Write a protein that binds this ligand. Structure first.
Ligand code: ONC
Ligand code: ONC
Ligand code: ONC
Ligand code: ONC
Ligand code: ONC
Ligand code: ONC
Ligand code: ONC
Lengths: 175, 181, 179, 180, 177, 174, 178
């Protein structure tokens, strides 16, 4: 028992121009997501693309690959948080086109990074990655580096409204 | 190991009947699957009822809340049906059905008590577990019409309800033995 | 090596309106049996449905889900025991339509419940007992035996012959060839 | 191993009305064999069915499920022992239509049952004896040997040659080349 | 794993009437080989059947199953040893139709049996199987039982020419005629 | 779930003349990449081929197999670093056609090799020297610069990769 | 990996008469390679076959199985070393048709055998018999003396393509399409 067929449902979502990041982020997810984003831009570089995010996070470099692809394509991107968006998941959520970042009412949003890496790396390198995340979160939340760094220190989740206040998303909708 | 074929694919057939199955433990991939089916069925007709079959011991809370938010999101009425059991997040989805359209078979077991803990994708702090718990208190109260204190006390009891008890408590609306007609 | 093709045999059985409970019972089996039963009722709610049972038991709640579905649908249900029907398997066997519960001559039938899968999640003493009582009532309903008779019999760790099962009220007919 | 294609080689064998019981016998093998036997009966309830046996034995109840099915259907059944027919395997071999039970020349036949298990769930001492006595009666029925003879023979932990199995009543003919 | 398509390589060999015993021998291999042999006979009980052998051996009863099917069918059977034919593998190689048992130049051939298979069996039984192997080898090589028993006692491989002298095969070929 | 269908998604990329080196490099990855490179050349020995690299590295000989095929085929090869190009990954990135080596803004490049198929000390060193020569050929740095730089256990940004000669362009938008 | 489709990549290579030996060699690989070689011979007895070799070695008897098939078929065989050709891999590389044995510039070639390979454990005399067969094969195709082969295979080392050329393992090292 695996995937149903419709009048494949995940292919159906791709016809809707929906890209799913609904799990832990690794290099395989990144490749699949990136391949889909470039394909949808080709079908149309003006029509919006929709990203469904239900991820606890994952590999940083895998997440930044998706982010860079989101920034590369010309399409407006509507991000949708369902379930949760934690760590790199919340970075992709905040990277949506301004005005088009949404969450469902009961989602949980976390920008705190966990205590991840394809290979072992040095202290100076984890900190360079961390600082890249600070700049991206700052860019898209309109918050200063300081309040980003301090907020990412708190090991906690935000509600959709808190995330809206903080600048991670724009709209919280029930229907 | 083989999923039989009909006059094609039994589970594709249920989906043509607008039937979605939550028939096991709930995790992120189940939620991904259910959610996609609900949004698909809505697009075929946003007024025609959808039916959700629930035989689940529970699972990941955020995955269950993902399904719950999608249930409340779509315009369709939703009939929930409990066969076997609806425990933990399973009973939440059962109680989240359209009022008057929440059913159980006669011998099912319903539990709103949450398990002591794999209801998390990643380990979390004490304060977050409590925020999630209160989210559940509010949802059970919203759909059962019981007060917070009644829900909080009831969820502290490690027990299952019978369908008739679940009906009196406001979790479901009718217990069926045979089809009306 | 795995499942030939008729000119799929299990899909052929489903054309015959045959449903298979041929292994241990869990939520996955229950979901598949239930989907088939409802599908067959829609093709026709009067044509008999046939359930083949060769099972050592399984999850109680999953077995009750099948049982409830059997009782829900309009179709008459012929139950056939090949090999054995143990624990929840004998409950489904006994739940067939009166006069339509069968067994092959050398099958083994046990209504004794094993000690201690059994449940999907761990449960309290009171819950295990409430499940046991649901079995008592079902067995009493379809065998026409009193509760005390059921409770005492289910306390014996033994198997029955098809004949003993007929005398006890679990099945109606024991057959060697097409009756 | 990956089956080739001519259409699948095993679906081709089913068109020839050949059912294979190769390897150990469990509930899944039984459900499959039974389904094939009932299917072949429907295609023609008089045409012989052929059963190839290369098995070391297996679950008793599963073996009896196949056996009862063999006795249920109308069709004649030819049994062919290739390699070995041990324990429940030799019971299916011996349950073929009288006169249509065969073996290749170098096969090994054993009616002795294996110690311990053969069982889907653990069982009491009285039940295992009940099942054992069922096997005595089946072997007695088709070999035309007495219960005492069967009980004593199954106590010996040994195999038979095809000709010993013929003289004992398990099979009817040992073939080296295609009969004409 | 990644089996290429030819406008299925292993089904192409079956069209050529080639059966493969290309690994260790167990009941599943025997079911397949036997099914293919009977299929090929039915398409023609006169045309030769070819058996490619690169096997280290395996289950005795499984190997005897194939052997019996080889002797059963009417077709002449050409056996071909590529790589190695050890234990039951060498028996199948030797069971080929007289004059049609071949090997490539660098193959290794062993009639020595390895020191469980099938199920746990008694001492008398394993000896009965061993005696069945002696007789088979003695039939197809034309050696006496004494010669067979002593040769199977040596833990060693033969070259194709040694196996030719011994009677296990008839032709050692480098290239086609 | 597995891969989606469009009209498979990676077969679509191949129709675009895109080859993916999107994970750790091993022999199986090498044989697949190689076959796609030779196939694309047959389709056309003149149309650019694009290589997407998100790799932490892998087997050296496997990576050199890919590198040699890149240098063999006549096509211009455009390399694109997304996420990271580390160890052999950064070598294939630098092996692109001059002027056609790219990276997205937040990628990480590392030419340091990892400390680690059961070979002798002389052979590990022979292999390392081959990497030096290759990096020196395509970055236009001298060997001493390559050897000292590969000693540092660090990652480069795309911009320092550019000034070092690993890539040519850092793109943000089309 | 997930094999892509073109309008299967490895079946496209086989239509080019390319057979791949791109990993460790075992009876499974040999069975497949042999089947491909005999199929391509029937497509044309004389058209060259191409063999891509990126292998660390494998079972000796499996390797000799492929080698015997290579010498059996009438087709000329072009060998192409990419990545590496170690132990039995280098034997297959060296077994190509004289003048048609190739390597890319950065490949590594090793004729030294490993110490551990064995379908079934064997005696000491047998493993030396096999070793002698490898000696004779390498001698035949490199045109070196047995003594030269025996000494070289002691040295636990890899050769460069140009060093394999002057030893007689291959004939051409090329960078771009000739
Ligand atoms: C039409 C189509 C369909 C599927 C995928 C791609 C395309 C078109 N298409 C591209 O989108 C790009 C390139 N390219 C080459 C030939 N066709 C295409 C070259 C690289 N470029 C930059 C890039 C790389 C990775 C991530 C983000 C951005 C994008
Ligand atoms: C027609 C169809 C078929 C299958 C799937 C989707 C659709 C249509 N369709 C949507 O239903 C939604 C969006 N969208 C964008 C393009 N097409 C669609 C965007 C937002 N999304 C909100 C959402 C997400 C998860 C759970 C609940 C609600 C709904
Ligand atoms: C036509 C068809 C085909 C396949 C499967 C079902 C159907 C028809 N069909 C039903 O049988 C039922 C419902 N339903 C909704 C749309 N179609 C159907 C909803 C309620 N359900 C009650 C039930 C649930 C579980 C177990 C037992 C009984 C029965
Ligand atoms: C025509 C056909 C094709 C495939 C499978 C079955 C059939 C016909 N067919 C039966 O053979 C039987 C029943 N049945 C009901 C509708 N069709 C059929 C019901 C009872 N069953 C008894 C039995 C069961 C298992 C083992 C041995 C004997 C036989
Ligand atoms: C036409 C065909 C196609 C595939 C497979 C077989 C056949 C023909 N065919 C047989 O060859 C045999 C039987 N049989 C029955 C219907 N068709 C066939 C029954 C007896 N069996 C004897 C045997 C068994 C095992 C090994 C050796 C010999 C041979
Ligand atoms: C047309 C096509 C399609 C797929 C693959 C190849 C081809 C054409 N094609 C070649 O490209 C090459 C050879 N060859 C033989 C028949 N067809 C082809 C032989 C030698 N090989 C050299 C090589 C090998 C590995 C890596 C790099 C270079 C190139
Ligand atoms: C046309 C074709 C296609 C695929 C496979 C084979 C053939 C043709 N074909 C043979 O090549 C051979 C035989 N044979 C019989 C019927 N067809 C064929 C018999 C002997 N075999 C010897 C051999 C075995 C292994 C390796 C090398 C040589 C060669």
């Amino acid at each position: 028992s695996l995937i149903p067929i419709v009048v494949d449902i995940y292919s159906r979502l791709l016809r809707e121009r929906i890209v799913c990041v609904m799990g832990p982020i690794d290099d395989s997810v990144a490749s699949l997501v990136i391949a889909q984003l470039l394909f949808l831009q080709s079908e149309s570089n003006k029509k919006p693309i929709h990203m469904y995010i239900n991820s606890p996070g994952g590999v940083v470099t895998a997440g930044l690959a998706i982010y860079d692809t989101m920034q590369y394509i010309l399409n407006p991107i509507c991000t949708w948080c369902v379930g949760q968006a934690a760590s790199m998941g919340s970075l992709l959520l905040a990277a949506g086109t301004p005005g088009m970042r949404h969450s469902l009412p009961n989602s949980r949003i976390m920008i705190h990074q966990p205590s991840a890496t394809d290979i072992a790396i040095q202290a100076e390198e984890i900190m360079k990655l961390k600082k890249q995340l600070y700049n991206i979160y700052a860019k898209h939340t309109k918050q200063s580096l300081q309040v980003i760094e301090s907020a990412m220190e708190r090991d906690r989740y935000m509600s959709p409204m808190e995330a809206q206040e903080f600048g991670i998303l724009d709209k919280v909708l029930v229907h």
